[PDB]
Amino acid sequence: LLQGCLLPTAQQGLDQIWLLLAICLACRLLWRLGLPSYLKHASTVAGGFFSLYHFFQLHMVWVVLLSLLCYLVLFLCRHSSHRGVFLSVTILIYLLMGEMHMVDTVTWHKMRGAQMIVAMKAVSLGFDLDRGEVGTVPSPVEFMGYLYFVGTIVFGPWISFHSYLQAVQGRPLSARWLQKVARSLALALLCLVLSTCVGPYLFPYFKGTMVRWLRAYESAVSFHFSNYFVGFLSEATATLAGAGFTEEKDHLEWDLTVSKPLNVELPRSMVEVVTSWNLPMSYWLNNYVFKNALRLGTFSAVLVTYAASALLHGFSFHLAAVLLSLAFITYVEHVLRKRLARILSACVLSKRCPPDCSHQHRLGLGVRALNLLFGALAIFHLAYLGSLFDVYGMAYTVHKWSELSWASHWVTFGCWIFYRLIG
Ligand SMILES: [Zn+2]
């Protein structure tokens, strides 16, 4: 195992990503030299081209296409107060065309992440221009540098245009920065190693229904650690490039957090799981899709947000089914937890209550028991939904979920039934 899984996996992951980290660090050193803004943006553009070429070979043209297309659309509507609408429509078109299989499936899937981040960045800049957070429409070099920020191009977290400009302005290289990068890299490598070695072999070492749930859980936990690897790597790359900082009370804190594994592995609620899964993505979907879809109602906005999330990850039927089930699961858990908190004056909300909340029962045994029951239900939902990601169409999804006897959906139905009845 020591030289059988750990070392090969660590080599596999650290090997390819090394170049990306190198360019992030190079960008960071180059952006502290006091170069003009134009030069900084152009430099990161060239770095983004080289990183995209390194990860996707000649097939980087699709991302290049999207980048130019989004700028073209933004430029054509540079005076319109509905820039986010036009950019979202053009992203919709491009994504749908790609999902229509016009491009090779292997090639398309290979760069779903980079294209997702570019699309999220373009839509976010359009909506920030609409709401007035960004004063003027950016120059071509600033927009292209924002899309090709080398710390946020391949697996990078979505960052706002203002966050990108703050990264451009630069910050002094400090011990705190290096500790953040090192911690993120170590956690990324650990999560990758866990995903490949610890995760898959959890229950056999570390075909009844119990066996099926064990296999489902280990496939879910392996998928989670793979996602955590991507999240921590994204934190490492973004911090190493100079972004992801919070200038709070004239005190700089490099605290960009993409994923919170402890809040998903040990979950209080499925809402917490979804939020902690990818904080940049959750924020993006919440601010640039959910708030714009509030005119359809709250539940319809939840469905629109999850459908946009399904399109951003690429339309595969298992992931679309997972996100459609997650909308109902999170909503039902949320409402039931809320109503239980109201009726039972307890701190059993989907998030932790503040220290000044009106709930009478705050630390009792019943509150801990209810939170543990909902956390076990959340782990159960995670194993159910993550069973689809073992190492895929409608038939696979149906059969695989039938192997688990549709337990989560019945449980979701029961929670929903309970919610309506008690109120
Ligand atoms: Zn409370």
Swiss-Prot record:
Membrane topology category: Multi-pass membrane protein
Family: Belongs to the membrane-bound acyltransferase family. Porcupine subfamily.
Residues anchoring lipid (S-palmitoyl cysteine): A175
Stretches in topological domain Extracellular: 27-54, 105-140, 331-368
Name of this chain's protein: Protein-serine O-palmitoleoyltransferase porcupine
Species whose genome carries this gene: Homo sapiens (Human)
Compartment list: Endoplasmic reticulum membrane
Tissue: Isoform 1 is expressed in fetal brain, brain, amygdala, caudate nucleus, cerebellum, hippocampus, pituitary, thalamus, heart, skeletal muscle and testis. Isoform 4 is expressed in amygdala, corpus callosum, hippocampus, spinal cord, kidney, liver, lung, spleen, uterus, testis. Isoform 2 and isoform 3 are expressed in substantia negra, spinal cord, heart and lung.
